[PDB]
Design an enzyme around this catalytic site. Structure first.
Site, PDB file in Angstrom:
ATOM      1  CE  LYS A 109      -2.024   0.662   3.633  1.00  0.00           C
ATOM      2  NZ  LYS A 109      -3.302   1.232   4.428  1.00  0.00           N
ATOM      3  CG  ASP A 114       6.084   6.478  -5.504  1.00  0.00           C
ATOM      4  OD1 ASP A 114       6.136   5.564  -5.302  1.00  0.00           O
ATOM      5  OD2 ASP A 114       5.600   7.438  -6.593  1.00  0.00           O
ATOM      6  CE  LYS A 121      -3.124  -3.326  12.068  1.00  0.00           C
ATOM      7  NZ  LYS A 121      -3.965  -3.894  11.504  1.00  0.00           N
TER       8      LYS A 121
END
Ligand SMILES: NC(=O)C1=CN([C@@H]2O[C@H](COP(=O)(O)OP(=O)(O)OC[C@H]3O[C@@H](n4cnc5c(N)ncnc54)[C@H](O)[C@@H]3O)[C@@H](O)[C@H]2O)C=CC1
Lengths: 121, 125
Positions: A109, A114, A121
């Site tokens: 993601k 960029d 997580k």
């Protein structure tokens, strides 16, 4: 309604079966036409799993003087760009299988936009 | 081999082998004790002129000439493995466990690991 950790890893394997070909051709090195294949298929096996996964255990003391054991997790997917960024979730259904998934999901993601640091997580 | 693994960790943490500074010192102290027993006797039986050659045994000599680090290890082990049995024998009585030793082994462990959480304030709050 399929399992989730299968879905994410399902996309990666699918999206690597596409880029694999146009990616051998754009390599520059002194190798065979087959040593490159063994170089692409190989890096794509290194990007896929999660590097580090931890697992904890807490002696918390409740308000009524009791004690109990809290139990946590943290998975850092990639180290290719540091640091790693990833939220913290409080839920009674936080397995170690869904932490590996969502970690890998952020490494990609935050690559389409960029943003430098990798996934956790 | 857990005990010796603890001794190796100390060897690597003192930066010197065991006894290097003490073997020849404790060697001289033994011969001055013997020469003390010899002199002291020959002040009582010594007018008779009989010499009394106090000397080490052929085994205690094989213990001085070959005194190395290896001896201290095989000693500190035989002291751990003994001081520790007397604590399992004991616990096997304080709870009347008879000849169940395995339970008495775990009971010592738990009862010592407990005394560290209790007198520490487990929570940092
Ligand atoms: N020619 C092309 O196909 C592309 C060119 N760019 C160029 O990059 C420049 C600025 O992009 P920035 O990334 O803002 O600057 P940057 O100079 O700091 O970018 C370093 C390089 O790493 C890549 N990158 C960025 N974040 C990444 C992440 N998390 N993981 C892996 N790779 C990552 C970028 O696409 C870039 O090529 C512009 O010149 C832009 O046009 C960006 C994407 C594609």
């Amino acid at each position: 309604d399929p399992n989730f950790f299968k879905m994410v890893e399902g996309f990666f394997d699918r999206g690597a079966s596409i880029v694999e070909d146009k990616l051998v051709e754009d390599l520059k090195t002194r190798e065979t036409e087959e040593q490159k294949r063994n170089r692409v298929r190989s890096i794509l096996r290194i990007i896929k799993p999660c590097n580090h996964v931890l697992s904890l255990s807490f002696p918390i003391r409740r308000d009524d003087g009791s004690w109990e054991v809290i139990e946590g997790y943290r998975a850092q997917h990639s180290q290719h760009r540091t640091p790693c960024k990833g939220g913290i979730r409080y839920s009674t259904d936080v397995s170690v299988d869904e932490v590996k998934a969502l970690a890998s999901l952020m490494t990609y993601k935050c690559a389409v936009v960029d943003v430098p640091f990798g996934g956790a997580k | 081999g857990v005990t010796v693994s603890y001794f190796e960790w100390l060897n690597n943490l003192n930066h010197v082998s065991y006894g290097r500074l003490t073997f020849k010192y404790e060697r001289d102290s033994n011969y001055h004790l013997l020469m003390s027993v010899q002199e002291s006797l020959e002040r009582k039986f010594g007018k008779h002129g009989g010499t009394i050659p106090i000397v080490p045994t052929a085994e205690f000599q094989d213990r001085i000439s070959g005194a190395s680090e290896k001896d201290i290890v095989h000693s500190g082990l035989a002291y751990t493995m003994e001081r520790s049995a007397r604590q399992i024998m004991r616990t096997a009585m304080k709870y009347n466990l008879g000849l169940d030793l395995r339970t008495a082994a775990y009971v010592n462990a738990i009862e010592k690991v407990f005394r560290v959480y209790n007198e520490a304030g487990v929570t940092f709050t």
